[PDB]
Every structure is written in C-alpha cells, then in structure tokens.
Swiss-Prot record, chain A:
Record GO cellular component, one term: U5 snRNP
InterPro entries noted in UniProt: AAR2, AAR2_C, AAR2_C_sf, Aar2_N, AAR2_N_sf
Physiological role: Component of the U5 snRNP complex that is required for spliceosome assembly and for pre-mRNA splicing. Involved in splicing pre-mRNA of the A1 cistron and other genes that are important for cell growth.
Modification Phosphoserine, positions: 236
Compartments reported by the entry: Cytoplasm; Nucleus
Name of this protein: A1 cistron-splicing factor AAR2
UniProt family annotation: Belongs to the AAR2 family.
GO biological process terms on file: spliceosomal snRNP assembly; spliceosomal tri-snRNP complex assembly
Matching Gene3D superfamilies: 2.60.34.20, Aar2, C-terminal domain-like
Other comments on record: Present with 7330 molecules/cell in log phase SD medium.
Self-association state and partner proteins as the record states: Heterodimer. Interacts with PRP8 (via RNase H homology domain and MPN domain), competing with BRR2 for the same binding site. Component of a U5 snRNP complex that contains at least the U5 snRNA, PRP8, SNU114, AAR2, SMB1, SMD1, SMD2, SMD3, SME1, SMX2 and SMX3, but is not a component of the U4/U6-U5 tri-snRNP complex.
Species whose genome carries this gene: Saccharomyces cerevisiae (strain ATCC 204508 / S288c)
Curated annotation (Swiss-Prot), chain B:
Organism: Saccharomyces cerevisiae (strain ATCC 204508 / S288c) (Baker's yeast)
Other facts: Present with 468 molecules/cell in log phase SD medium.
Positions of region (RNase H homology domain): 7-237
Protein name: Pre-mRNA-splicing factor 8
First and last residues shown, out of full length: 1836 to 2069 of 2413
Gene encoding the protein: PRP8
Note on domains (UniProt): The MPN (JAB/Mov34) domain has structural similarity with deubiquitinating enzymes, but lacks the residues that would bind the catalytic metal ion.
Length: 300, 237
C-alpha cells in the first residue's frame, strides 16, 4: 500500500483521491493519504475553499516513484513533487503514520469501482496526452484546452487527445463519401484502431481518461473527447463483439459513478439519444441503456 | 452563414456563387400493383445549379438508370447531388470555381460539405429564402431535355435569355423567381399568361418569350395577380 504525504495544508481545500473526497481546514494537521492500492493509476485533486475556480490535480502511479504534496504560496497551489531519497521518504511517512496524521484510502473490499473506471488507463499513455517529460506524474485542471479546441492557445499546457472529426479527410475516403459518413467503420477500424491507437485497449484507455478529467475537473474538452470516442464506435456498423461488450461495461461504470447533480453539464443529449436509440449499436449496450433509463430518464 | 433577405444584394456581387436545388433529382409516380400494394416508378430528374449573377444554369440530367438496384433512394439522391456538384466544380477552371454554394434545402449541407472537403475555401451555405426552383420542370425546354435523356447528360443554359442586355442581375433574378413562383402556384394559368399573344414567340436559343420592356411589366403584373388570386382561393381570403 503506497502513501502520498503532505508537507502541510496551509489553505482550506477539498481534496479528492480517485472517487473519494475529504474537506481539510486552514492549517489543519493533515499530512496525507495512506493505503493507496497498488496496481492502478490514481488522481489526487483539489478545489480551494476560498476560490472554487481551478479544480486541478495530478495523475500518478506509486510504482513509478515516491510522490508528495507541498503547498507553494507563490503559485498558490498544492504541487506534487517526487522525493528521490528513498530512506528520507520512508522516515517522513513512518513519522506521519505513527502520529495518525494521514487519511486512509477508503476502499471497500467488494468495491471494484476504481478498477472498472481505470481498467485500460496507463500512466505512459497519460504522459503522452499531458506532455511534461521532467515529471513522472501529470497535472490536469478545469481550464486546460485540447489540441482540437486550440485548432478551432499555449500548446505546452494542452490535452493532446487524438483528434476525431467526422467531416475531415481523415474520416472520409475520397470516393466513399456517403459510405464513410453514414458508416464510420473505416474511420474506427483502419484509421483509429489499426493506425493511431494500435489496439482497442489504448482506445479505451484514452476514452476512460477523458471521462475522468471531465468528471473530476469539469474539463469541457475532455467531455467532448469522451462523447466523440463513444459516438465513433456507436456510429460504426462493423465493431468487434469483444469491443462492444467491453464498451457496455466501461460506460455502465462511468454512468454509475457520475454525480446525479452533474448529469446536466457532463452528458450530451444528442450523442446519448443517437448512441442508445438510432445508431448501428442501439441494441449492443444493454447494461448502459438500462442504467441511463433508470438514472437519467429526463436526458432521454 | 445563412443567406436571407438581409444579405440579398450579396447574390449579385462579383464573388462567383451557385445555388443548388435538389428537389427534382429523385422523381417518382406512385401506383397500385396487381396485388393491390403500392410501388414507385422513377422518372428522369435533374440537378438545378444556377449562377444568379450571370444566369448560367448547369442542368445535370439524372437518368433513372442511376437508381437501379439502389436502396434508400431519397437519401442517395442527396449524396448523388453532392457528388455531381463536386464533379462540376472540379471540371471548371480555377478562376470559374465558385467561392460559395448555397443549397436550397438544409438536408444538402452535410452531403455537399463531405464531397467538397478538397475545397476548404468554398463556403457551403443554407438559405432562409423560399426559392421556387422546384418549378424548373414547368419550363417546357428544360422538361423536354430531361424527359428525352437516355443517359446521364449535362446541358448548359442561360435561364435569363438575353435579359441582362437590358436589366441588372438583381432585376433578372427577381423576374425569374416571380415567373417560377407563378408556375409553381398555377402552372396552367402561368403558361397561358406567357403564351396568350401568339405574335410573341420564344427564340430557338431562348427559354422565355421575346417580350419588350413594356410587355414584361404587363406580364410581371399578371404573374403577381395570379399569385394573389391563388392565395385568396387557398385561404378563402
């Protein structure tokens, strides 16, 4: 079980760790999060009590280094840092644990929610979407734009999601205009899966990462990417059966986890009605259709 | 964006533009079968592609053979239209290519956008104008070439005859839309107005009769009267 210690908590803040969250008071004796499950990526995220603008956070894997949080009073945020001295890090963690100044990652044994949301998400794929090669962890916030949003303004601070555009030369073979526009199978299977992603696991990883940035940061460009990657599969007549079955599992857990009160800002009416009721795959997403009809029948 | 009453003079500026109307591409008669089911029979159609500044009409005849063994014909007709407009643009020299294509029906926007991806600087626009170009097949010489076609054919016309020798493009387009609106509303009455005086003929190289400036004023008044008469008959007003 790995640990992310905190130097201190000088400003009042809501701290997220994956799907969990904890309120910390100004100068509360808080020194971090222990018992973080090894085997998954994690996200540690923040929303300041005195300024709910910028949600921000860090994606990390405790297998890739020893990470801690320290508030920077100049830049006014909680920063993730890596501690390269192993024995120093172990001794800091041991002290804070002995003084019981850490919250425990509150995982229920029966509860596979975080695995279900991150099954295909790899830290190496996150670090290619979020480019800052000097750190092993990745900063994301509410305001970061995508390469696609930027095309339609600082490229070093962008989310490098794969660009999906249904009315683009990449999506439409000259001579197959009607075919490729009404049936996106070419674009999904040849361009995206065989060409860019190499396999469905990488495609699902990016879809899962987009959803999580949309949900945890209210990152609008990430929500656009999540819906575009769903629509691209649902709008293809030819999809491997294993991919349709896996997509239904992926979306079921995403809809299950979404806060009920954020459905209005996080779900695109057009895409979901098209995907569940009109598309080639309208009958392929039985679990997702059932949770959407029971949880969000207004949207539909 | 959308072409409307506000930006009407834009149609007659020096930026090349075409109207595309797909109404008459897929044309059928509906009939009973022997077993008492209903079937369609396609007839030849046409794409109406018009330069409103110059009157140049690119009439692409759609021969019934293009529907043979195809499904979802009303959908396919939009994509075939877009395919043929794209082919016409590629056929024109660079300096003759349009800067804008205005579709009369919003269902043509996606098909035409996707066929024109190779031309990102040609704007594809809808219009809020209700244009009567469906009535093109009320112009006897256009109907005749469409019906006689035995294969796909492009036929070029000037839909303004020689009117631009005497009037502006704005006025010629206004006359054209008035004539087509009258032909759409009451074809028989409109044709009677146009052919009533035998001494006024249609030149071999024209679509419309050879009216003097004073006769065109009378004809235009009679067409307005027909349209108002028909509106009163329709609404009991």
């Amino acid at each position: 079980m790995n640990t992310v210690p905190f130097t201190s908590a000088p400003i009042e803040v809501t701290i997220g760790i994956d799907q969990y969250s904890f309120n910390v008071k100004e100068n509360q004796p808080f020194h971090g999060i222990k018992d973080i499950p090894i085997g998954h990526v994690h996200v540690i995220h923040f929303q300041h009590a005195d300024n709910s603008s910028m949600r921000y956070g860090y994606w990390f894997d405790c297998r890739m280094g020893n990470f801690y949080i320290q508030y920077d009073p100049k830049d006014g945020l909680y920063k993730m840092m890596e501690e390269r001295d192993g024995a120093k890090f172990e001794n800091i963690v041991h002290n804070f644990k002995e003084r019981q100044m850490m919250v425990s990652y509150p995982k229920i044994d029966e509860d596979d929610t975080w695995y279900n949301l991150t099954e295909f998400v790899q830290m190496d794929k996150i670090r290619k979407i979020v480019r800052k090669d000097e750190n092993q962890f990745s900063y994301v916030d509410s305001s970061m734009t995508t390469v696609q949003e930027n095309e339609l303004s600082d490229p070093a601070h962008s989310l490098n999601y794969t660009v999906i555009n249904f009315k683009s030369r990449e999506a439409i073979r000259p001579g197959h205009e009607m075919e490729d526009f009404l049936d996106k199978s070419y674009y999904l299977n040849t361009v995206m899966l065989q060409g860019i992603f190499k396999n469905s696991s990488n495609y699902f990883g990016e879809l899962q990462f987009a959803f999580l940035n949309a949900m945890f940061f209210g990152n609008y460009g990430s929500s656009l990417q999540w819906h575009a990657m769903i629509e691209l599969i649902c709008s293809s007549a030819t999809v491997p059966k294993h991919m349709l079955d896996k997509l239904d599992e992926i979306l079921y857990y995403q809809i299950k986890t979404l806060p009920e009160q954020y459905s209005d800002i996080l779900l695109n009416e057009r895409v979901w009605n098209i995907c569940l009721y009109s598309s080639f795959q309208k009958n392929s997403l039985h679990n997702t259709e059932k949770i959407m009809e029971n949880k969000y029948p207004e949207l539909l | 964006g959308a072409m409307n009453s506000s930006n009407y003079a834009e149609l007659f500026n020096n930026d090349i533009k075409l109207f595309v109307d797909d109404t008459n591409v897929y044309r059928v008669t509906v009939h009973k079968t022997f077993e008492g089911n209903v079937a369609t029979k396609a007839i030849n159609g046409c794409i109406f592609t018009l330069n409103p500044k110059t009157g140049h009409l690119f009439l692409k005849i759609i021969h019934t053979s293009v529907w043979a063994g195809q499904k979802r014909l009303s959908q396919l007709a939009k994509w075939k239209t877009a395919e043929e407009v794209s082919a016409l643009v590629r056929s024109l020299p660079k300096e003759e290519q349009p800067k804008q294509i205005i579709v009369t029906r919003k269902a043509m926007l996606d098909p035409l956008e996707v066929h024109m991806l190779d031309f990102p600087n040609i704007a594809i626009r809808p219009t809020e104008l209700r244009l009567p170009f469906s009535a093109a097949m009320s112009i006897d010489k256009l109907s005749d070439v469409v019906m006689k076609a035995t294969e796909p054919q492009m036929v070029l016309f000037n839909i303004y005859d020689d009117w631009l020798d005497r009037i502006s493009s704005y006025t010629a387009f206004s006359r054209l839309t008035l004539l087509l609106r009258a032909l759409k509303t009451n074809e028989e009455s409109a044709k009677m107005i146009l052919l009533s005086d035998p001494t006024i003929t249609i030149k071999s190289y024209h679509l419309w009769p050879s009216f003097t400036d004073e006769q065109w004023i009378t004809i235009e008044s009679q067409m307005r009267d027909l349209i108002l008469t028909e509106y009163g008959r329709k609404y009991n007003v």
